[PDB]
Amino acid sequence: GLFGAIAGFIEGGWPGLVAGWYGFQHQNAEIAADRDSTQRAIDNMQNKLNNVIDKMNKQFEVVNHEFSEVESRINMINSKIDDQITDIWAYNAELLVLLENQKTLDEHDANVRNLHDRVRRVLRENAIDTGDGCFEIDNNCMDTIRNGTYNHKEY
Amino acid sequence: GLFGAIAGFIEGGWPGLVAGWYGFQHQNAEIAADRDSTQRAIDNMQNKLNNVIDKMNKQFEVVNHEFSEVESRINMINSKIDDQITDIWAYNAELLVLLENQKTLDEHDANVRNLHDRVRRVLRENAIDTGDGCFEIDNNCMDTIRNGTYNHKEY
Amino acid sequence: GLFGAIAGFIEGGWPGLVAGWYGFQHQNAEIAADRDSTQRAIDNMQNKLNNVIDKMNKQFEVVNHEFSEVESRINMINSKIDDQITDIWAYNAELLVLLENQKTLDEHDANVRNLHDRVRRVLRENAIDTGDGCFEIDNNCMDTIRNGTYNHKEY
Amino acid sequence: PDKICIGYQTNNSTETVNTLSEQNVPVTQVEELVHGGIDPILCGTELGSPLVLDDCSLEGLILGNPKCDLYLNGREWSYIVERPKEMEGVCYPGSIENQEELRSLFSSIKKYERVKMFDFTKWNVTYTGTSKACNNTSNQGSFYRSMRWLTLKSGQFPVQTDEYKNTRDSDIVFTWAIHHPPTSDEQVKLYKNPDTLSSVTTDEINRSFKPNIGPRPLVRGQQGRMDYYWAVLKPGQTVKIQTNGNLIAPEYGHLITGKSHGRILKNNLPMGQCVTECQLNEGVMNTSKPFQNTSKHYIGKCPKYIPSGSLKLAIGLRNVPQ
Amino acid sequence: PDKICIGYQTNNSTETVNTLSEQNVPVTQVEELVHGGIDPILCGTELGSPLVLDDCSLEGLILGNPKCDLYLNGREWSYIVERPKEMEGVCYPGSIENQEELRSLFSSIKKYERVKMFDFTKWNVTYTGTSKACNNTSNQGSFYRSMRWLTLKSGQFPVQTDEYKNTRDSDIVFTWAIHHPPTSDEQVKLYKNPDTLSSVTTDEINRSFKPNIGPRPLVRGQQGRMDYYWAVLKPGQTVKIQTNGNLIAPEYGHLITGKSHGRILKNNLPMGQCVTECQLNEGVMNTSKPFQNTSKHYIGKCPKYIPSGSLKLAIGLRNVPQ
Amino acid sequence: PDKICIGYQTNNSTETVNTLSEQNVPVTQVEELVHGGIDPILCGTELGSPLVLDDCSLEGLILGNPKCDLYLNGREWSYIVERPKEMEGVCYPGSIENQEELRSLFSSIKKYERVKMFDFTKWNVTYTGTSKACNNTSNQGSFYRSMRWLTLKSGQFPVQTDEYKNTRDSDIVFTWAIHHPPTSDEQVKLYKNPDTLSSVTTDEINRSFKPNIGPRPLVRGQQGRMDYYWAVLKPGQTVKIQTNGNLIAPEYGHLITGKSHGRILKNNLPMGQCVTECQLNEGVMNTSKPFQNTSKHYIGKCPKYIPSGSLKLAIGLRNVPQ
Ligand SMILES: *[C@@H]1O[C@H](CO)[C@@H](O[C@@H]2O[C@H](CO)[C@@H](O)[C@H](O)[C@H]2NC(C)=O)[C@H](O)[C@H]1NC(C)=O
Ligand SMILES: *[C@@H]1O[C@H](CO)[C@@H](O[C@@H]2O[C@H](CO)[C@@H](O)[C@H](O)[C@H]2NC(C)=O)[C@H](O)[C@H]1NC(C)=O
Ligand SMILES: *[C@@H]1O[C@H](CO)[C@@H](O[C@@H]2O[C@H](CO)[C@@H](O)[C@H](O)[C@H]2NC(C)=O)[C@H](O)[C@H]1NC(C)=O
Ligand SMILES: *[C@@H]1O[C@H](CO)[C@@H](O)[C@H](O)[C@H]1NC(C)=O
Ligand SMILES: *[C@@H]1O[C@H](CO)[C@@H](O)[C@H](O)[C@H]1NC(C)=O
Ligand SMILES: *[C@@H]1O[C@H](CO)[C@@H](O)[C@H](O)[C@H]1NC(C)=O
Ligand SMILES: *[C@@H]1O[C@H](CO)[C@@H](O)[C@H](O)[C@H]1NC(C)=O
Ligand SMILES: *[C@@H]1O[C@H](CO)[C@@H](O)[C@H](O)[C@H]1NC(C)=O
Ligand SMILES: *[C@@H]1O[C@H](CO)[C@@H](O)[C@H](O)[C@H]1NC(C)=O
């Protein structure tokens, strides 16, 4: 992907993570999903889906007309209109799905990269980036990192 | 946003900055906009606006036709053409604005991230990234950082 | 560009690099292209080109009709259909090329940034980022960095 | 040593999506945009139930074919269905001028009811004519219910004339016809005049017709042939008939009101007791999906037609095994 | 300690834009793409000023209705406007064949001027006929200026014939008609012949017409009725008339030249002294914006029509308070 | 000190691409999407070789004009070409009713061959009529090959009648016409009857025609004029002719079979020995490119038409000198 997080430096995903898309897995003395980034992502993929359904929602009633043997031209002219409008919509419908699928996969890729960055930014000098989406350093301190309240000045 | 600079790690903007979009605010012994990135951004948003106006600029004169009581079909066939072409343009016009708005907001988001990166790259070991778009370290030296001439070997 | 690698912090390209797009140039005691990122890029630009050709591949045979002096309206109605469908395709054809060109240039920009990041991530503490796409530190060790097998624990 | 890591979801979903740069990309969550199925049944819409026709065609129900006596009381509909088979329309051989327009006009309107325009009791000619071509359900020689065949009375056919004015506050559709005898004897036996002048006139139209004696090829065991016509009488307007032979004069007209869906579907679908939002010639449909692949020709609120069988939109992220 | 920081702009702008993923996103700078207003006035284009009609319809100006004597000198236009009200066109009851085409052809051309085709001084029949149906402005019994009503002279109507050739280096549009008397007496009083043969022939067309005696419903206090016709005579071609009664013969034709906008607008807008790039039935417009929402039907260089009232494009970045 | 660096490609390519945000962006690799050229030649398609016409028009080949005797044996085609010049069609002055439809129907079908419908040996009238208007290649007074001019025999013209039934298992296209003499003498010399009744009837159509004596302007040195007609006889149907003068009766009909491309091209292109996938009025074309800019009107498998001369897609990256 463009942002090189999903199937990049974080090679694999977590099957244990069922609650949401993006989450934290620690290892201390003693797995959960981040509700800030994941809820904001769900909002974007419900508003996107609705807009796609809304843009296609307008209807027009295409009547079938009868023509005599001496009305060959106006019959051909009518069939052209129906065949040529359907081609434009078949193009639009197919093309929009290929364009938004590519953006959706890259949007998810960016959400992980941003969540990895904002944790690196709050921890500062205390931890070291392994380079596989991990940070070598209490359950409160691990919980203060999750909700983004960790004070590096304390440690 | 995708690049996670605007409303990300730099939480808020500066109301004092009126001259341009992106700029520098320092604090030394003794606020201004970067003219390289901001001018290059204005070029992209004048060429984009012009291309949108140009793509819609082509005109065709849609005449109103009169039909008798025995010309019901060719009247219906004519009304279908006008109603179905307008739907395709109404779709295109509406869809193009939703697609380019999303890109514009994310393009501005990337311009800040790049301007934050190129300052981090020139300063090197001398400064420390606070993680809120700031760098703890003369007016000449602050001016040499702005135009990207700062020599880290001197300090 | 959005990712600020191509014509960004790496100011210039290498005319010596003919084998592929992205590559490595070192300087040790004793130039080549990365085959992982470059092959994956070629796959995306062959599948993209094919999809553009496929979406336009559907044909319809637009007949020329003859009309008498008393058939002025149905002649005008027929000419409107042909002139208005061609405008929509002329728009689509022109607009799709401007949209995908912008994405292609930014996709190439991201491929370099990702290749610069994954080398920085494998080397870890041993090297120092100059800030012009270089890393100050055997031909085997330089070869182990290329294919991404370098063990930083050894040094 | 204590560590913290950021990671993403994966599941045993076999769903793939296409992009412009890559084919069949595994993803976690997907949404199908194309409804593939139909329920092959005819349901009623918000305008009401449709008029299904399996015995009589529409032009036979207008002309009042004697095998279509069921529909004399009058009908209203949301849309019209015609069975694609041999249907009883025009009984006596001949063509309807602007037939495609007549069927289009009559299907456009919601309701129709018969109205008596001309009283043939006062007319000084015989109006009780029948034909073997226009048999009733009992195979008795009959004729159209909405028109009368005018022949001679006491060995004479004088110049007849009568008027009718529309004061119903609604349009009336009426039909007439010109009979063309095969031989010279038929013209002198039926009407008694070798050459006749017939004409139908209103406030807007002015139409006149002549016969021409000459035999035709047999169509329904009849050497003769008719030329059928129709017109529309607006509220307040006046229609006036005049002939000295060779007219199938109008007795009844059709009082038309409201707007239908303006549709004649052609299917063998079973009529079901149901209400629907969308109705196709292929069947009925109720879905949340933006697309459908059964037909572009539909009536009511329906999804958009594309020829694709399946379109998958990515909701979730790339499905990456550990 | 000395520090340096990178930041972005914010202002007190209440402007929001929509994206595919989010509704109403605050931004710093915006551009409106839809012009919402019109100036409800009729202006002239680069082809010239239009022909506004509030007294006479177009088919009355062609036929030369005696209440439309203002337009005998001839007119040229950029486009034509007709007031949507009761307009004076065809005075004598009857229909124009291919009326929609005639109006379409005549509006397509820029300029027209009258030309005398047939001289009725040499003709051996009376051509001074008038009717109460075709009153002039003073309510005197008159007739069409471009056609003459041919009746009997000294109790006879011989077979008349005359020729006219077009040598003006431009097309000519002319009209004729066939009168259908109500009674048998009217046919013998006016033309004196119970049955008459009339015909109009050129190098391309060959047309013949018969009357048919029969009364009609009253339209403008007249039991009679006419059938109006028209044709186009090309440069070098020859038209030749021939009758023995029952023709409204052409005296004048219309010499047509150039191309107009080919448009008949239907509005009650005031005619203003102004030049314009774009003209609508709803009004006039001059803007830099790519879109407009007033009508799809326009003439000249105009923005694209969409039904949306407002479309906002993001120029600036997301508006984030400190 | 040992160092490693990451970098990208550059070359001496002068190729530029446009984006929405920037004009003329240098890039390494590009793909042209618009084929700009054509080969100005007429080639045959997968249906076969076309029928090129430089001497006779299509309506003259149907009527059987005596200068078009080359095409009596019959032809089949993929498509039809007509040279844009003075072509020999209808020899005797007159118009073909529904001419645009006849040409459309006849071009739609693949193959045609002549079939004798009516035998004039048994008919009791002279059928050997010719005209100076319809000269053969040797400038001898001749007539149409598919129709016969019926005149009087031994100073009489009785009421003639004959029947033909189609049992070929394929449609037949036939033409007739009505002659309108200029003077009264011509009507009595040719047909001997001042007023005549002609009619053409089948199982579906019922048509009758009257002459009208009156001179016309000279077209091809002929004061007279004809009115040409056509019809289609389906398999099993029966056509029957009947007249007492004033008919150009059908002798031969055209047996039609299969489907063509249904096209009449209008060009002066040279006929070449070649097979093609796509054929235009402007020439022939074989390319891998998705777009082309020569014409929207084409036959066969062809790229999409856009008015742009060149469209460049970026394959490589931005071209940045060191
Ligand atoms: C519309 O698309 C559908 C779905 O692809 C097709 O109908 C069938 O759908 C069922 C599932 O509901 C599949 O199991 C069948 O295999 C599909 N049919 C076929 C032939 O594959 C159908 O092809 C399309 N319908 C029409 C009328 O074209
Ligand atoms: C076209 O859109 C415009 C703008 O939304 C509408 O016209 C009015 O515009 C003014 C501002 O110039 C607003 O104050 C009014 O409220 C708008 N009218 C309404 C009813 O809201 C108008 O709706 C549209 N015009 C047409 C003819 O459809
Ligand atoms: C279609 O586009 C082509 C290519 O731009 C034009 O034809 C010529 O193409 C050759 C190269 O094959 C150029 O050297 C010529 O300069 C082009 N002609 C012109 C006038 O520039 C052509 O303009 C277009 N063809 C049609 C029929 O419109
Ligand atoms: C009408 O009925 C008669 C006998 O009553 C029969 O001879 C004739 O064939 C019938 N007509 C048709 C068209 O079936
Ligand atoms: C014949 O019928 C007409 C109306 O059609 C009527 O006016 C007339 O009185 C009738 N004839 C007689 C002798 O009453
Ligand atoms: C024409 O004028 C006469 C009196 O001069 C009048 O009786 C008649 O009603 C007028 N016609 C119309 C249609 O107003
Ligand atoms: C009657 O008019 C015709 C032309 O319409 C003319 O040729 C003829 O001479 C006139 N009659 C007499 C007796 O002059
Ligand atoms: C037909 O040929 C004759 C002489 O054989 C000639 O006078 C006449 O002009 C020719 N017709 C045409 C239309 O050329
Ligand atoms: C005249 O021709 C008809 C057929 O057109 C035929 O039936 C008749 O026998 C012929 N006349 C004579 C006297 O044979």
Short mmCIF file of N, CA, C and O in Angstrom, two decimals, chain A residues 95-131:
data_model
loop_
_atom_site.label_atom_id
_atom_site.label_comp_id
_atom_site.label_asym_id
_atom_site.label_seq_id
_atom_site.Cartn_x
_atom_site.Cartn_y
_atom_site.Cartn_z
N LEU A 95 -16.55 1.86 -12.79
CA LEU A 95 -15.33 2.71 -12.62
C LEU A 95 -15.29 3.27 -11.20
O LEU A 95 -14.19 3.25 -10.60
N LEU A 96 -16.42 3.75 -10.67
CA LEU A 96 -16.53 4.35 -9.32
C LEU A 96 -16.10 3.34 -8.25
O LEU A 96 -15.45 3.76 -7.27
N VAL A 97 -16.45 2.06 -8.43
CA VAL A 97 -16.17 0.97 -7.45
C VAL A 97 -14.67 0.65 -7.45
O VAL A 97 -14.14 0.40 -6.36
N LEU A 98 -14.02 0.67 -8.62
CA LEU A 98 -12.55 0.40 -8.75
C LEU A 98 -11.75 1.56 -8.13
O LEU A 98 -10.67 1.29 -7.57
N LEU A 99 -12.25 2.79 -8.25
CA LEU A 99 -11.57 4.03 -7.76
C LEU A 99 -11.66 4.12 -6.24
O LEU A 99 -10.64 4.45 -5.61
N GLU A 100 -12.84 3.85 -5.67
CA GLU A 100 -13.12 4.02 -4.21
C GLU A 100 -12.57 2.84 -3.41
O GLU A 100 -12.21 3.05 -2.24
N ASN A 101 -12.51 1.64 -4.01
CA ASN A 101 -11.89 0.43 -3.39
C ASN A 101 -10.41 0.71 -3.12
O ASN A 101 -9.95 0.42 -2.00
N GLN A 102 -9.70 1.26 -4.12
CA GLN A 102 -8.25 1.60 -4.04
C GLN A 102 -8.02 2.62 -2.92
O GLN A 102 -7.04 2.46 -2.17
N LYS A 103 -8.89 3.63 -2.80
CA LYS A 103 -8.81 4.72 -1.79
C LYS A 103 -9.09 4.16 -0.39
O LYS A 103 -8.38 4.55 0.56
N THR A 104 -10.10 3.28 -0.26
CA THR A 104 -10.55 2.65 1.01
C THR A 104 -9.39 1.84 1.61
O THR A 104 -9.13 2.01 2.82
N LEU A 105 -8.74 1.00 0.81
CA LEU A 105 -7.60 0.13 1.22
C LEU A 105 -6.43 1.01 1.68
O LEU A 105 -5.76 0.62 2.66
N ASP A 106 -6.20 2.13 1.00
CA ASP A 106 -5.09 3.09 1.29
C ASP A 106 -5.47 3.99 2.48
O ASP A 106 -4.54 4.47 3.16
N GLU A 107 -6.76 4.22 2.71
CA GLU A 107 -7.28 5.01 3.86
C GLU A 107 -7.05 4.21 5.15
O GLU A 107 -6.58 4.80 6.14
N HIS A 108 -7.38 2.91 5.14
CA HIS A 108 -7.14 1.94 6.25
C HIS A 108 -5.63 1.84 6.53
O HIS A 108 -5.26 1.75 7.71
N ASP A 109 -4.81 1.86 5.47
CA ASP A 109 -3.32 1.77 5.53
C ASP A 109 -2.77 3.00 6.27
O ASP A 109 -1.80 2.84 7.03
N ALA A 110 -3.38 4.17 6.06
CA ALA A 110 -2.97 5.47 6.65
C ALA A 110 -3.39 5.54 8.13
O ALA A 110 -2.63 6.14 8.92
N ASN A 111 -4.55 4.97 8.48
CA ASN A 111 -5.13 4.98 9.85
C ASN A 111 -4.19 4.25 10.82
O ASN A 111 -4.05 4.73 11.97
N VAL A 112 -3.59 3.14 10.38
CA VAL A 112 -2.61 2.33 11.17
C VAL A 112 -1.32 3.14 11.34
O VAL A 112 -0.85 3.25 12.49
N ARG A 113 -0.79 3.70 10.25
CA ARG A 113 0.46 4.51 10.21
C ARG A 113 0.34 5.69 11.19
O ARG A 113 1.32 5.96 11.91
N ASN A 114 -0.81 6.38 11.19
CA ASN A 114 -1.11 7.55 12.06
C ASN A 114 -1.17 7.09 13.52
O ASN A 114 -0.65 7.83 14.38
N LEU A 115 -1.78 5.93 13.79
CA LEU A 115 -1.94 5.35 15.15
C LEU A 115 -0.57 4.90 15.68
O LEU A 115 -0.35 5.00 16.90
N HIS A 116 0.31 4.42 14.80
CA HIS A 116 1.71 4.03 15.12
C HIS A 116 2.55 5.28 15.43
O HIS A 116 3.40 5.21 16.33
N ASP A 117 2.29 6.38 14.70
CA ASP A 117 3.05 7.66 14.81
C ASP A 117 2.70 8.37 16.13
O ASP A 117 3.63 8.83 16.80
N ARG A 118 1.41 8.45 16.47
CA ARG A 118 0.91 9.24 17.63
C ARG A 118 1.34 8.56 18.94
O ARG A 118 1.44 9.27 19.96
N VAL A 119 1.59 7.24 18.92
CA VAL A 119 2.11 6.45 20.07
C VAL A 119 3.62 6.71 20.20
O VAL A 119 4.10 6.85 21.34
N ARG A 120 4.34 6.75 19.07
CA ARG A 120 5.79 7.05 19.01
C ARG A 120 6.04 8.48 19.51
O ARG A 120 7.08 8.70 20.16
N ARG A 121 5.11 9.40 19.24
CA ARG A 121 5.21 10.85 19.56
C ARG A 121 4.98 11.10 21.06
O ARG A 121 5.60 12.04 21.59
N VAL A 122 4.10 10.32 21.71
CA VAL A 122 3.74 10.49 23.15
C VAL A 122 4.81 9.84 24.03
O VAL A 122 5.10 10.41 25.11
N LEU A 123 5.38 8.70 23.61
CA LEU A 123 6.40 7.93 24.38
C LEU A 123 7.75 8.66 24.33
O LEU A 123 8.47 8.63 25.35
N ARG A 124 8.10 9.26 23.18
CA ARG A 124 9.32 10.09 22.98
C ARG A 124 10.57 9.21 23.15
O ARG A 124 10.69 8.22 22.40
N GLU A 125 11.46 9.55 24.09
CA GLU A 125 12.83 8.97 24.22
C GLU A 125 12.79 7.64 25.00
O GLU A 125 13.78 6.89 24.90
N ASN A 126 11.71 7.37 25.73
CA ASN A 126 11.61 6.26 26.72
C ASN A 126 11.67 4.90 26.01
O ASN A 126 12.36 4.00 26.53
N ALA A 127 10.98 4.76 24.87
CA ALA A 127 10.87 3.50 24.09
C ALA A 127 11.79 3.55 22.86
O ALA A 127 12.36 4.63 22.59
N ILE A 128 11.91 2.42 22.16
CA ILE A 128 12.72 2.26 20.91
C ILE A 128 11.87 1.52 19.87
O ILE A 128 11.32 0.45 20.20
N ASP A 129 11.75 2.08 18.66
CA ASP A 129 10.97 1.50 17.53
C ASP A 129 11.73 0.28 16.99
O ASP A 129 12.81 0.47 16.39
N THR A 130 11.17 -0.92 17.19
CA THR A 130 11.72 -2.22 16.71
C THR A 130 11.75 -2.23 15.18
O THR A 130 12.72 -2.78 14.62
N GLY A 131 10.72 -1.66 14.54
CA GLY A 131 10.56 -1.60 13.08
C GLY A 131 9.59 -2.65 12.56
O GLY A 131 9.63 -2.93 11.34
#
